[PDB]
Amino acid sequence: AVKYLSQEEAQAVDQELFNEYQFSVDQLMELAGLSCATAIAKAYPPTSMSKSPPTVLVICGPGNNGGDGLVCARHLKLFGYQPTIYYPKRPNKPLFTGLVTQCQKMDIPFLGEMPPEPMMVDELYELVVDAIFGFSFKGDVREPFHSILSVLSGLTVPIASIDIPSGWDVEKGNPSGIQPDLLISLTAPKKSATHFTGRYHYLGGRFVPPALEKKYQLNLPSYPDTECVYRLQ
Amino acid sequence: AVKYLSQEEAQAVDQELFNEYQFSVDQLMELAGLSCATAIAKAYPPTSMSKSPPTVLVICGPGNNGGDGLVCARHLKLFGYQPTIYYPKRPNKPLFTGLVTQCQKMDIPFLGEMPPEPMMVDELYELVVDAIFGFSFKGDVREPFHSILSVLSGLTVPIASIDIPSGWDVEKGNPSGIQPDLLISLTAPKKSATHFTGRYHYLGGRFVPPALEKKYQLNLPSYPDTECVYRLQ
Ligand SMILES: NC(=O)c1cccnc1
Numbered sequence: 001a002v003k004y005l006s007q008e009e010a011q012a013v014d015q016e017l018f019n020e021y022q023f024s025v026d027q028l029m030e031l032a033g034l035s036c037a038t039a040i041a042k043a044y045p046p047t048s049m050s051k052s053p054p055t056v057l058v059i060c061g062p063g064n065n066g067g068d069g070l071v072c073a074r075h076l077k078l079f080g081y082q083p084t085i086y087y088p089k090r091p092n093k094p095l096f097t098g099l100v101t102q103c104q105k106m107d108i109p110f111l112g113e114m115p116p117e118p119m120m121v122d123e124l125y126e127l128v129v130d131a132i133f134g135f136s137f138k139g140d141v142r143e144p145f146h147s148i149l150s151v152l153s154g155l156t157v158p159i160a161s162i163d164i165p166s167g168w169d170v171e172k173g174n175p176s177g178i179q180p181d182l183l184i185s186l187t188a189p190k191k192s193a194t195h196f197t198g199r200y201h202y203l204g205g206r207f208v209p210p211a212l213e214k215k216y217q218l219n220l221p222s223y224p225d226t227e228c229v230y231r232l233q
Numbered sequence: 234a235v236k237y238l239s240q241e242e243a244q245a246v247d248q249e250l251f252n253e254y255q256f257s258v259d260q261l262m263e264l265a266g267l268s269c270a271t272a273i274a275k276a277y278p279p280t281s282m283s284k285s286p287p288t289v290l291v292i293c294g295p296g297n298n299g300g301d302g303l304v305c306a307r308h309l310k311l312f313g314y315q316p317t318i319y320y321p322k323r324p325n326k327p328l329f330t331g332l333v334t335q336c337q338k339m340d341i342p343f344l345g346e347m348p349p350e351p352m353m354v355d356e357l358y359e360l361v362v363d364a365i366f367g368f369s370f371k372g373d374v375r376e377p378f379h380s381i382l383s384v385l386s387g388l389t390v391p392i393a394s395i396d397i398p399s400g401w402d403v404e405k406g407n408p409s410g411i412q413p414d415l416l417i418s419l420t421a422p423k424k425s426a427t428h429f430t431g432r433y434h435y436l437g438g439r440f441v442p443p444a445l446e447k448k449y450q451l452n453l454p455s456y457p458d459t460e461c462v463y464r465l466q
């Protein structure tokens with residue numbers, strides 16, 4: 001029975017990965033990101049899609065979720081998707097700088113603004129990746145995010161959330177939030193992930209050292225062969 | 234027809250990845266490394282192996298090949314292998330520092346010395362990963378490497394080379410060198426890889442931007458679905 005994490009649990013575990021075990025943020029983000037694009041490509045394969053190539057909106061927030069998001073975009077390009085990225089609040093740090101520019105020399109479009117009504121989103125993108133807020137977030141959804149979140153939960157087309165449905169109280173979830181169709185739990189799943197309603201819940205981040213796994217008695221599922229994602233249930 | 238690279242070609246391409254496209258060395262090394270452990274796990278699966286868990290020697294040199302090597306070790310642990318690492322000449326830089334310590338808190342053994350005769354190697358390890366020298370190397374195999382290379386080409390058990398069979402003149406190859414059974418070409422394959430004799434030749438490093446691919450007219454094979462490795466022929 002794979003454990004779902006308290007907010008403090010996760011941040012400590014995260015803590016070790018950078019502290020004791022010395023994974024750089026570069027490293028794990030790439031894999032977080034790779035896991036994401038993997039999950040998505042599996043969930044919703046291009047063959048099974050309605051356009052060639054299949055369009056996806058990646059909506060990246062200001063912290064790390066954004067990061068994973070950007071990686072994910074780029075791998076999904078590689079995987080055959082035609083992503084567009086909207087990245088409103090960008091911190092001025094080489095990491096995020098780097099990932100942006102990577103995406104840019106992938107001929108990945110960035111949008112300067114969110115289209116205002118969900119119907120136009122639905123019309124321009126087959127899948128929306130929610131890269132806004134992750135575990136460590138603690139309410140106070142400032143603009144423009146409230147406004148995007150607002151649009152998002154109006155969509156017909158499905159949303160893929162990275163780690164957390166943005167704006168779900170990380171433990172509470174949110175009865176009235178956005179209800180994404182795929183939730184890629186990274187590292188371990190989060191208490192909120194029990195409120196998850198949709199059709200795909202992959203786990204990702206094949207990097208937990210078994211010592212860490214036995215520490216925070218995670219009972220991780222065995223990933224198959226060489227995969228970096230596992231479907232749940 | 235996938236192009237095999239001149240030494241200068243590769244280093245320029247590499248050059249762009251860090252320059253124009255701004256991939257950090259952290260990033261691409263992880264994927265290089267992940268590709269490697271992938272290739273190996275596929276080539277030689279634990280089920281098909283003779284011990285449980287299947288032992289592997291990873292021999293890491295002083296430059297980047299070593300790096301990929303160390304990553305690879307750790308992913309292969311994750312993949313179900315029981316690797317040991319011998320890492321004689323270690324540069325004092327946080328990158329390599331980091332990867333070591335990662336491996337260490339994976340309960341991965343490091344050897345203090347190379348066992349002297351290949352028969353003992355054969356007896357203690359089912360597969361030897363050659364993480365010594367890559368493309369950019371330019372002869373003058375200094376000790377202890379000549380001595381290890383010497384042991385290596387005496388082995389019964391198979392060798393997996395990362396990017397290059399260490400001590401093959403990167404273009405010439407080496408008729409009388411080590412003759413590894415799996416060669417994981419990273420990014421693109423190298424002129425020497427035409428002299429390759431053994432049974433598995435995977436290509437790896439799913440990160441080439443198609444602009445780069447069209448630039449250095451690489452004609453890369455399409456990786457399947459979400460894989461980070463392709464078997465050749
Ligand atoms: N965003 C990440 O890289 C990450 C790292 C560890 C746990 N969860 C997510």
Ligand SMILES: NC(=O)c1cccnc1
Pocket residue numbers: 247250261262263265297298301419420421438
């Ligand atoms: N060692 C690596 O990360 C690498 C990067 C680019 C090309 N080949 C190998």
